[PDB]
Structure 1
Amino acid sequence: KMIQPFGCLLALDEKTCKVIAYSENAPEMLTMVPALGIGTDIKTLFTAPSASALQKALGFAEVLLLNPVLIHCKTSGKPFYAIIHRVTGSMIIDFEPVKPYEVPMTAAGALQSYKLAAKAITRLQSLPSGSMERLCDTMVQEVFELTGYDRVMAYKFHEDDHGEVIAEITKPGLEPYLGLHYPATDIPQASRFLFMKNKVRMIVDCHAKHVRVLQDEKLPFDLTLCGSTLRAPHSCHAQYMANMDSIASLVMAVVVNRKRLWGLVVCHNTTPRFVPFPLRYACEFLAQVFAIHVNKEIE
């Protein structure tokens, strides 16, 4: 029930379209502090066509969900990307903030993001088969040019489930990890499914003060939120990251197919870092492609 404080979270009831859980920083972020709490209808917060654009999604099944919806707060004119997913009877929105001079550029930032992702995919296919080393080298390189982080590493999970840094690129001056071997318990099991579930997963600042999520108290159970892109890490991984002077990361999951988590393609930064939803989504596609050629060379 914790989320990172670079965006905010709102869950709604699918039938009524009324807030049934909100993150602690939502009302400061989305209104002028007409208020926001349990109960709020969403027409009272955004402009009409953002509001009208959210309600259409209720109807779309999750084989027709198209993110991000670009929204504008009613009064402030403040613009966010809204990022939807569905857990049985309930909608859950991640809002992520848009700088104002990006609003005119949102279609062609989308297009460019995929354009780089697609090209890097071409460089992948044209590679001669046989070598896991040049493949995984190309993967981490392309991801480095694509994402700008301070370090990029692939991992590979052996049958014991422990991992070996099998590939690596960094900006000049940083200590290497290429080759090293760490224990299978360094990544807990329920974390491993979560990676499998949210194909891309992002931590903007491990020293962030995290924020709480408040649900309607007339619900007899607790609502599932670990799908949200604003999922807050465990405080244990946050200290591990700070000690090793990696403060941001972005993760990609390597699921082959007999379906298994093979590995992870990862970026680490030594200062804060935020990449917006159009990129993260491009990386979903690169990840699948990479999973397919990894499985090919196993054969």
Structure 2
Amino acid sequence: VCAREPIHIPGLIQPYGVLLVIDPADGRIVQASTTAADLLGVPMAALLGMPYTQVLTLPEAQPFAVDDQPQHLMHAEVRFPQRATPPASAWVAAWHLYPQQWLVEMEPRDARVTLREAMPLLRSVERDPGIAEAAVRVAKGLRSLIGFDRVMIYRFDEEWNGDIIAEARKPELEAYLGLHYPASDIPAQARALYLRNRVRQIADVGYQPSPIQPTVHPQLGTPVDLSDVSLRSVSPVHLEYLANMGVTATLVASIVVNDALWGLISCHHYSPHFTNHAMRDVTDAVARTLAGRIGALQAVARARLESVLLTVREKLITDFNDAEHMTVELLDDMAPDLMDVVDADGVAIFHGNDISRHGTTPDVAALRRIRDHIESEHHEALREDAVGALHVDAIGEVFPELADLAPLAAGFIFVPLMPQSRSALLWTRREQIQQIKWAGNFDLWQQTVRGRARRWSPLHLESARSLRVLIELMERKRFQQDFTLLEASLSRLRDGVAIIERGTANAAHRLLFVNTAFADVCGSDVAELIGRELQTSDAPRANVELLQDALRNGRAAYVTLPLQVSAPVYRQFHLEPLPSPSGVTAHWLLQLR
């Protein structure tokens, strides 16, 4: 139920500032935070329904009507012309202009040489190698700039769990660097708002919130969507957490990379600390700058890998096409590249009952168990829902029966997906134990994750899909290998054979294959005979009819008929239908001693 909280409609503000909801129609204040009455000259009752111009004046920029896309005015100087001296400090206001509402949030200026001071840090990260180096540079650098007791770089993993990859802290305290946090700690709903509103601040934990006096819109009958307002009251859940932790102030800047939430810049203060708009703007700058390099280094990385992976793949393709006899040594020379293209620990090449095991891989019988399990009708759903190839990161999860084997085959890539059989390819990765330091799931916990291999890189997975061609290459080569063998065998027979292709009644019944013993009795050789109509009257009408009726229907016949001599030569014509997938005769076997 907690992971289902609205959070964007709390109907409360952080007391450090004031919020006003204005009807753009008349320009009158429809809703207001309880803190408004004190800052502005007039108490609540009269302030409600009053025009905004009457109570607050702003010289820099003014609100305006918006058509569809909401527009946001940044923090500018705002004055309160309705009281005999109301500035116990300087005030600054920001707008959120919607087509049905105007949202003005105001807070003190403060400031205390900032954007120029941040420039050397930005420049220094914008050119440093690897994420690690940049993360730690940003951590230390922001700790110097904004001055928080803790500055940590929190990276989201694939299942949205966090990891503190970088940290800058006071000499005292215990480092949270290296700690793992669940996905449950930051709900989807919350994560969305960090992508929306990039810099989030908790000025003092355990603040006494300011409720928006008219809770719902008096004419729209809805609460205030505070999704863009910085004054948005945080979940009491999270507040209790921070309070239990001893941290009293919080600054969180979103590390958005390629329009995706990559991670967060988490800042904790064990005393209260309001970060003013000007400073928030600097942290946003460093977050974007860091966010930038991470994606730059990620790009250069992909680029490099992508090429070498192709160079290898392409060697594999030629080497396989060039060789006509798939030998043990062929597969032994091929094996390293075949493993390398996908960064596997082992590979097993299957060719119907035969297994060419290479690298660090389970025993032949164990490999058979894995294949037999995948090819199963139970896991039939798995292959369909799969994309080009079937792959696992922890065999024990996906195939609970195959829970063991994991020390050598924790992860695997399997090609082809169809239970096509004969030729297949099993790439394996051995179990790599993970030592993960939790937040407590008064001391530390180290989960020692077993039965999982290193995650299959999407780039390696596409490398795998790109090798499906080696499977049909084997199959094609194998059929062609067998075909010639059977063609050889047939031609060397004594009992005169020929295959007959049924003409779709448009074409006549023509010869497809003819053996040497057959083409001899006829006289003329094989190449002259391929593509010659079987209808080759002298021969009794009765006997021919029997043969013609078998062809007419797609049935069998056994009839003695005279041939063509270069004695006239009579033979017994043994026509027989060969099984068709459709069940409708398309070919016949003709033999006749």
TM-score range, shorter chain: 0.7 to 0.9
Structure 2: how far apart are the matches of 1:234 and 1:35? 28
User: Normalising to structure 1: TM-score of the pair?
Assistant: 0.87
Q: Deviations over 1:108-133 (max 9, x none)?
A: x6xx3221232321111232x2x221
Q: For residues 1-299 of structure 1, what are the structure 2 equivalents within 5 Å?
A: 1-31=11-41, 36-47=46-57, 50=58, 53=60, 56-58=62-64, 65-74=72-81, 75=83, 76-78=85-87, 79-98=90-109, 112-127=113-128, 129=129, 131-215=130-214, 216-257=217-258, 259-298=259-298, 299=301
- Percent identity over the alignment is 28
Q: Quick one: structure 1 residues 242 and 125, their matched pair in 2 at CA, closer, same or farther if it must change by over 3 Å?
A: same
Conserved 8 A contact 1:205-1:272: yes
| Deviation of the 1:221 alpha carbon | 2.3
Query: Displacement, 1:72?
Result: 1.4
Cα pair distance change 1:86/1:117, threshold 3 Å? farther
Larger Rg: 2
Give 2:17's aligned amino acid: G
Greater relative CO, 1 or 2 (CA 8 Å, sep 6+)? 1
Q: Does the 8 A contact of 1:252 with 1:264 survive in 2?
A: yes
TM superposition shift of 1:63: 9.0
In structure 1, C-alpha distance between the alignment counterparts of 2:119 and 2:50, rounded to whole Å: 41
CA, structure 1 residues 269+34, in 2 after alignment: closer, same or farther (shift >3 Å)?
closer
Letter in 1 for 2:275: V
Q: Give the Cα–Cα distance (whole angstroms) in 2 for the partners of residues 6 and 177 of structure 1.
A: 29
Q: Is the 8 A contact 1:57 1:65 kept in 2?
A: no
The letter for the 1-side match of 2:286 is L
- TM-superposed CA distance for 1:223, in Å, is 2.7
Q: Aligned pairs, how many?
A: 282
Name the SS of the counterpart of 2:175 in structure 1: coil
Aligned residue identity for 1:81: V
Are the equivalent residues in 1 in contact too, given 2:253–2:287 (CA < 8 A)?
A: yes
**Deviation sequence 1:7-46 (CA, Å, 0-9, x none):** 1101112232211211012102221569753311122213
Counterpart residue identity of residue 142, structure 1? G
Deviates more, 1:183-192 or 1:60-69: 60-69
Gaps of 5+ in 1: 100-105
Distance change >3 Å, CA 5–CA 218, structure 1 → 2: same
Equivalent pair of 1:247/1:268 in contact (CA under 8 Å): yes
- Contact 1:9–1:22 (Cα < 8 Å) also in 2: yes
Going from structure 1 to structure 2, the CA distance change for 1:274 and 1:166 (only over 3 Å counts) comes to: same
Q: Does the 8 Å contact 2:28/2:50 carry over to 1?
A: yes
How big is the alpha-carbon RMSD for the aligned residues of Structure 1 and Structure 2?
Answer: 2.2
**Paired amino acid for 2:202:** I
TM-score w.r.t. length of structure 2: 0.45
Deviation at 1:231, TM superposition (A): 1.0
Higher mean C-alpha deviation, range 28-37 or range 57-66: 57-66
